[PDB]
């Protein structure tokens, strides 16, 4: 373990909120704060999973994917350290940082792919997340700092950059007006498209939506439109897929029903199929990482769809739920948070009590 | 005292339902007798060793003590048949009549408890009031699955069901007399109250009725206490319209569950909140009504649970909730889920960025 990750893995990531990133982005003269805090921040956080990947089984951990995401991750840390001596008012340095956070971001690109290969071939031992609680548990640790890594070196990216500058009306990634209804129409389009081709038929949708805050007016909040449209994109592909196999012999398909509702602190969005169901007895398993009614192949198999959305949701204190009608259809529904100040970073931290995660008869 | 801790030693024996009516059939009243006069000082004695770990002021309220005082008396009641044959007749007759009087003892237990957690609040911090609500959940269970057990047995032998499990139970037709009773208080108190709207899917036998093997007084408890829930969100929600949305229910018959789904408009909860409101005596009602006890849903949710099933509330907060029965819809699944006193329930009384 090279020293600078010993080092930095023995502090805390620092969780930012939405309206923090907001005033980030509000404005010019914050590129030298941003500067000053990701440089030691992107050091942190990359250390504490850096720790917390040693601590792996290491037939896992000797996977050429694994030592590919590890010195990955050293390299980053290292080129984001080699700033430390520099003044935050330096504009060459200032110039040179974003640079570097477009090299991290490119060597960072196939993360989560690799990670998922170093998972497969380990699957050797036969060991699994769906069987194997430790690395179910790992796995949301290791991918929702990646969530949180690229958040922050994005925002920095698309805020300061000369050549990438994101959509004009966000800040960063952050559409501070974010249209709700618009994003789940477009996610339901896009599953619609694959599905035909599995298919030659898919559900209709039949929307509602309820704006609890202000009656009768658009419902609009401050969110990361790709990270709502991937939570969208994957449980649209669930439903719809459970909906055709479960209806095949009928004259048609039941639509999918969705509801947005907008209350004081939360935005909900509930997706209701009629695609059978599923027994209560293996609701849980639906959650861990590769488990998939599917044959391995892409509409499924990979078993990814559905704990990534769920970090996507608990990413800034939201949350993602499944309840079903075994023999009906299936609810699930995504919880975020209204108010961008309470829209907080959720990180996990390397520390005692990590660790250790690694009287009824019931 | 001595026997309860030799009694603490065994572990409580779950039992499905098609046990019950397997053995509750032929009219078995010796076996019965043998089974219960060591399985009912064995659950006393396991729930026994339990309050003694407790908060020392807690133990102390009067109302635990009664509790405790209680239980050891039933448990002693009950031992003293170990010294008799099962085909004693006078034995097993007066085993009957000691059932019936434990019964009798224990019937104010619940309140009792309840009222010993506030002499604790009012005489005496979080971790502490998490590990209440774990004693909590324990503790009814294990009365829950005596008076169960009990009840089989004075129902069957003492002078359709068997006892009080129903082999055909008309989930829909105890879905329809929960919502009336439900609809009664509510039209008292209220003036007004909901329609039921109700649609059922027999995904197991297309077109059938729904029949599973089930104890209707507990399901009857449960949807009871979740219509109440539901009429108050909606009147109090929809307290300035002329009318008031229905609650919609679903009863649905699948391989393994037998799931019930019961829908409010009446303006839902905060996600924030959601955990709290299982929490026992949480309630936003002052304190007939139909609220503010804050029992309503712990309780339903150790019913649905004792048996392997669960209930779940969610809400879209604004607009309204759903909350969900699951069943298990075959009797040899359905089986006894039951709290044990050993080293890993004493073990039982950060890793995330806060
Ligand atoms: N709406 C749904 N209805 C029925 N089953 C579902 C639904 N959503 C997910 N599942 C089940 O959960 C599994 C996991 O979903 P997911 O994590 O998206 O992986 P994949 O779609 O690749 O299988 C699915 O294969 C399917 O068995
Ligand atoms: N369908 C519902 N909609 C809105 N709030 C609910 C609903 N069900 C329960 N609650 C909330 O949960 C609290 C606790 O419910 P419960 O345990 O039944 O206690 P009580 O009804 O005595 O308050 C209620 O007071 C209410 O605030
Ligand atoms: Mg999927
Ligand atoms: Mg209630």
Known sequence: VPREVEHFSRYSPSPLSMKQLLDFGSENACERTSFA????????????????????????????????????????????????????????????????????????????????????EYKACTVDPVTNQNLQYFLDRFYMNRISTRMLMNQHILIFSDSQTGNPSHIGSIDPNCDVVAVVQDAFECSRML???????????????????????????????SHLHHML??????????????????????????????????????????????????????????????????????????????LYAKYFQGDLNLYSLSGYGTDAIIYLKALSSESIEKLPVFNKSAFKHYDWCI
């Open 195 to 225: 599905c035909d081709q599995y298919y030659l038929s898919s559900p209709e949708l039949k929307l509602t939506q309820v704006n609890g805050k202000f009656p009768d007016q658009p419902i609009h909040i401050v969110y990361v439109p």
């Open 37 to 120: 805090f990701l440089r030691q921040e992107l050091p942190v956080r990359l250390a504490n999973i850096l720790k917390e990947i040693d601590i792996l089984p290491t037939q896992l951990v000797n996977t050429s994917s694994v030592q590919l995401v590890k010195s990955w991750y050293i390299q980053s840390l290292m080129d984001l350290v080699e700033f430390h001596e520099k003044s935050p008012d330096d504009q060459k340095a200032l110039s040179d940082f974003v640079d570097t956070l477009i090299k991290v971001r490119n060597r960072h690109h196939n993360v989560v792919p690799t990670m998922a290969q170093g998972i497969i």
């Open 233 to 310: 994109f994957e449980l649209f592909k669930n439903a719809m897929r459970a909906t055709v196999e479960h209806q095949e012999n009928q004259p048609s398909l039941t639509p999918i029903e969705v509801i947005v509702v907008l209350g004081k602190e939360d935005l909900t969005i509930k997706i209701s199929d009629r695609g059978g169901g599923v027994p209560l007895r293996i609701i849980d398993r639906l959650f861990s990482y590769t488990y998939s009614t599917a044959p391995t192949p892409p509409l499924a198999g990979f078993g990814y769809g559905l704990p990534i959305s769920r």
